[PDB]
Amino acid sequence: HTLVWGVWVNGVDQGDGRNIYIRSPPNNNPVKNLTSPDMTCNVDNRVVPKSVPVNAGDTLTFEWYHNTRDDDIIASSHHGPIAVYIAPAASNGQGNVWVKLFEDAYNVTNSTWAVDRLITAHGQHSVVVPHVAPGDYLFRAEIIALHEADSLYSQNPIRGAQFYISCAQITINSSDDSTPLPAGVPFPGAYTDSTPGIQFNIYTTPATSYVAPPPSVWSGALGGSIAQVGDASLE
Ligand SMILES: OC[C@H]1O[C@@H](O[C@H]2[C@H](O)[C@@H](O)[C@H](O[C@H]3[C@H](O)[C@@H](O)[C@H](O[C@H]4[C@H](O)[C@@H](O)[C@H](O)O[C@@H]4CO)O[C@@H]3CO)O[C@@H]2CO)[C@H](O)[C@@H](O)[C@@H]1O
Numbered sequence: 001h002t003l004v005w006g007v008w009v010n011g012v013d014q015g016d017g018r019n020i021y022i023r024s025p026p027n028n029n030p031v032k033n034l035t036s037p038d039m040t041c042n043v044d045n046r047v048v049p050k051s052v053p054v055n056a057g058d059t060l061t062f063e064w065y066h067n068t069r070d071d072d073i074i075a076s077s078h079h080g081p082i083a084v085y086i087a088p089a090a091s092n093g094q095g096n097v098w099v100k101l102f103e104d105a106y107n108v109t110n111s112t113w114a115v116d117r118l119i120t121a122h123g124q125h126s127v128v129v130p131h132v133a134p135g136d137y138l139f140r141a142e143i144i145a146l147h148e149a150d151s152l153y154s155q156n157p158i159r160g161a162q163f164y165i166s167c168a169q170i171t172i173n174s175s176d177d178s179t180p181l182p183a184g185v186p187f188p189g190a191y192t193d194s195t196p197g198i199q200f201n202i203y204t205t206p207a208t209s210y211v212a213p214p215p216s217v218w219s220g221a222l223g224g225s226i227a228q229v230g231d232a233s234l235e
């Protein structure tokens with residue numbers, strides 16, 4: 001159970017974005033029905049009033065929280081990967097539009113899942129803004145918690161993979177548009193019962209054996225990281 005508070009741009013806090021520039025759900029309950037419209041931008045997808053100004057090459061940092069900003073972020077039990085996707089805001093998240101900018105599942109070195117490191121990062125994880133066409137975009141951050149993904153939701157609707165999905169309204173101003181955005185995948189649609197990384201038993205199977213759901217990260221993506229980029233306690 002976790003939600004996005006707001007974003008930082010190049011380490012500068014953009015302020016509380018809930019229902020302002022984040023398309024926030026009314027609470028932190030997971031999405032589990034893979035076929036549901038709720039997989040796009042969670043259960044309350046609608047245009048919110050603001051969209052955060054950024055340029056290509058900027059560092060955009062998502063800040064998640066559990067109950068209060070900068071608390072314990074998400075329960076330790078919720079081991080799993082983190083992905084970020086982009087789509088033209090034009091799409092309202094409909095059709096084959098979602099392009100992956102970032103994937104992080106398990107780090108063999110430190111033996112920590114992305115979710116583990118996000119708690120350590122005080123809810124902060126980033127992507128570098130790609131050189132797409134200037135315009136309006138949704139950035140879709142997705143945490144998959146696997147603490148019950150040994151089952152499928154479609155078979156046993158009180159278990160299943162859990163998706164914490166948050167869409168941010170981002171306006172890209174300056175960009176040489178050196179990497180025009182391609183078509184991508186639908187949500188709902190890209191993930192099915194068969195897709196790798198949806199059904200997995202983190203109780204029995206090594207986390208080195210884990211394979212995150214496709215698609216792969218776009219060649220135009222400029223990477224990203226899970227790590228604190230600024231101190232919410234001084235805001
Ligand atoms: O630990 C291994 C074990 O996990 C089992 O699943 C557990 C989770 O471990 C546990 O984190 C989870 O806790 C949930 C709880 O069910 C929710 O009711 C609660 O929701 C809160 C929310 O946290 C608040 O922010 C909000 O304000 O209020 C709501 C209450 O409506 O959120 C916590 C997590 O933060 O409970 C799971 C079981 O239900 C697996 O089932 C098991 O297989 C594993 O072995």
Ligand SMILES: *[C@@H]1O[C@H](CO)[C@@H](O)[C@H](O)[C@H]1NC(C)=O
Pocket residue numbers: 033035036037157
């Ligand atoms: C999942 O979502 C689809 C489409 O929204 C819906 O028809 C179906 O009833 C849902 N599944 C469950 C278990 O509710």
Ligand SMILES: [Cl-]
Pocket residue numbers: none
């Ligand atoms: Cl839970």
Ligand SMILES: [Cu+2]
Pocket residue numbers: 001002030075078
């Ligand atoms: Cu939870």
